[PDB]
Amino acid sequence: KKISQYACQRRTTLNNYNQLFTDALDILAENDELRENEGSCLAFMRASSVLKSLPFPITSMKDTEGIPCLGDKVKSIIEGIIEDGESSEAKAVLNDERYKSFKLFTSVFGVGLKTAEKWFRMGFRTLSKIQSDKSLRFTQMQKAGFLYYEDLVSCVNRPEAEAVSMLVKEAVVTFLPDALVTMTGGFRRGKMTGHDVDFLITSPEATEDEEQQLLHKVTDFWKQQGLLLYHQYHRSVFERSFCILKLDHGRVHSEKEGKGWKAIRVDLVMCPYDRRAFALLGWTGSRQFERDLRRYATHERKMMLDNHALYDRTKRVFLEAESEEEIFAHLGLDYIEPWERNA
């Protein structure tokens, strides 16, 4: 069996035998991303992704034979790690001032690349200086990011994601009692931690007006309960909401006070019932698994896959699916479980 270049033709569990290589490659991809070197970034991400799927650790350069997405630049990074136990290249990025600042500024909710470049070019290097500056002005998203900084930079754990899950279902069934709530993202793929909790909401019986208003009702309901700390909606091409919820500690059933609550990033997506298999596939990730799913669909099958449909260009028909298994089968792909999509 020859290893495929597509992550959607590989099984990638959270058991990484090559973390010494993939951690170095992820730093190198992140660096390029923060410099807007998209091509160099995507190239590092594909190499990192293929090594995460390996059932054994690389111990020599010979172990690298037959593996796709392993260019000449990437091979020199691999050899360097085999020789020293560390990547001088990734260590350089870790010591780079632009990398250090961009990673720190974008760690604030509301801060993207244009805001992080602006602050860096003003001579700012710490959040303390940003926050106390009397001339800087911030967006409502950034103020929330600064206000709940420590809680948001703290990992969201599985008991917390479940405590959030209960709050989402309770709020949703108040307006659409037949609605299906599904936890997506890294938590669906078996991750222990995340930076946020994602949910997909859908209703068999709901009308166009009912699905358009549900996220507004859910948030108004949390606002009346005093649980909403921040919210931002985004029109349909799905109805989305990006919140910051107040999560009381008494709601968290873990093995483990000083302020009995934690601010949690929650993302909600409402989708029409007949597009649910596509939305679940699209919102489960990982990001590399999606990119390869769409790349394989286009290059191999002459099909167009997105978050709401699968179109066959040869047959001139949209392909229907009531499940992710049906989408895989239409793509001519063996089914890959959510826990094998950690590409």
Per CATH, is 155-273 categorized as 3.30.460.10? yes
Which pair of tokens denotes residue 124?
């700012």
Helix (H, G, I), strand (E, B) or coil at 341: strand
Residue 205 DSSP one-character state: S
Tell me which residue of 227, 297, 290, 211 sits closest to 261, measured CA to CA.
227
Structure determination technique employed:
X-ray
Spatial strand order of the sheet with 261-270 comes to 180-183, 197-202, 261-270, 239-248, 228-234
Q: How would you classify the pairing of strands 261-270 and 303-305?
A: unpaired
Summarize the annotated binding site as residue ranges.
Answer: 186-191, 195-198, 267, 282-283
Amino acid sitting at position 284: T
The residue from 23, 63, 96, 267 that is catalytic is 267
In this chain, the answer to whether the domains covering 1-95 and 96-154 adopt an identical fold is yes
Tell which CATH classification among 3.30.200.20, 3.30.70.890, 3.30.210.10, 3.30.470.20 matches the domain 274-343: 3.30.210.10
Return d(Cα 13, Cα 340) in angstroms, integer. 5
Q: Would the CA dihedral through 155, 163, 197, 116 be positive or negative?
A: negative
292 is catalytic: no
Task: Compute how many other C-beta atoms are within 10 angstroms of the C-beta atom of residue 140.
Answer: 10
Q: Which residues fall within 8 angstroms of residue 36, CB to CB, at 6 or more apart?
A: 113
Return d(Cα 25, Cα 43) in angstroms, integer. 10
- The CATH superfamily assigned to 96-154 is 5' to 3' exonuclease, C-terminal subdomain (1.10.150.20)
Tell which CATH classification among 1.10.150.110, 1.10.760.10, 2.160.20.70, 3.40.50.460 matches the domain 1-95: 1.10.150.110
Phi, psi of 254 (to 5 degrees): -120, 175
Return d(Cα 59, Cα 81) in angstroms, integer. 10
The residue from 32, 151, 196, 292 that is catalytic is 196
**Which spans in the chain are helix H?**
19-34, 38-52, 72-84, 88-95, 97-105, 113-121, 127-132, 140-147, 149-153, 158-175, 185-188, 208-225, 276-284, 287-301, 324-331
Q: Which residues fall within 8 angstroms of residue 18, CB to CB, at 6 or more apart?
A: 51, 52, 54, 57, 58
Q: Which residues fall within 8 angstroms of residue 265, CB to CB, at 6 or more apart?
A: 109, 152, 156, 195, 196, 197, 242, 243, 244
Residue 12 DSSP one-character state: B
Q: In the beta sheet, which residues pair with residue 263?
A: 246
Return d(Cα 319, Cα 326) in angstroms, integer. 9
Amino acid sitting at position 59: T
Q: Which resolution in angstroms does this entry have? A: 2.2
Q: Which residues fall within 8 angstroms of residue 272, CB to CB, at 6 or more apart?
A: 202, 211
Return d(Cα 178, Cα 206) in angstroms, integer. 9
The residue from 32, 151, 198, 292 that is catalytic is 198
Region for residue 184 given its phi and psi (left: phi exceeds 0; alpha: psi -120 to 50; beta: otherwise)? beta
**Cα 59 to chain center, whole Å?**
30
Distances (CA, A) of 5 to 33, 300, 333: 21, 12, 14
Distances (CA, A) of 4 to 62, 256, 292: 18, 43, 11
Return d(Cα 179, Cα 202) in angstroms, integer. 6
Summarize the annotated binding site for Mg(2+) as residue ranges.
Answer: 196, 198, 267
Return d(Cα 41, Cα 19) in angstroms, integer. 18
Q: Contact at 8 Å (CB) between 218 and 172?
A: yes
63 is catalytic: no
Return d(Cα 206, Cα 201) in angstroms, integer. 11
The alpha-carbon radius of gyration of the chain (Å, integer) is 22
Q: Which residues fall within 8 angstroms of residue 218, CB to CB, at 6 or more apart?
A: 168, 171, 172, 175, 241, 268
198 is catalytic: yes
Domain boundaries, the chain: 1-95, 96-154, 155-273, 274-343
Summarize the annotated binding site for a 2'-deoxyribonucleoside 5'-triphosphate as residue ranges.
Answer: 186-191, 195-198, 282-283
Q: Contact at 8 Å (CB) between 244 and 144?
A: yes
Return d(Cα 207, Cα 205) in angstroms, integer. 7
The CA-CA-CA angle for residues 96, 24, 7, to 5°, reads 130
DSSP result, 291-318: HHHHHHHHHHH-EEE-SS-EEETTTTEE
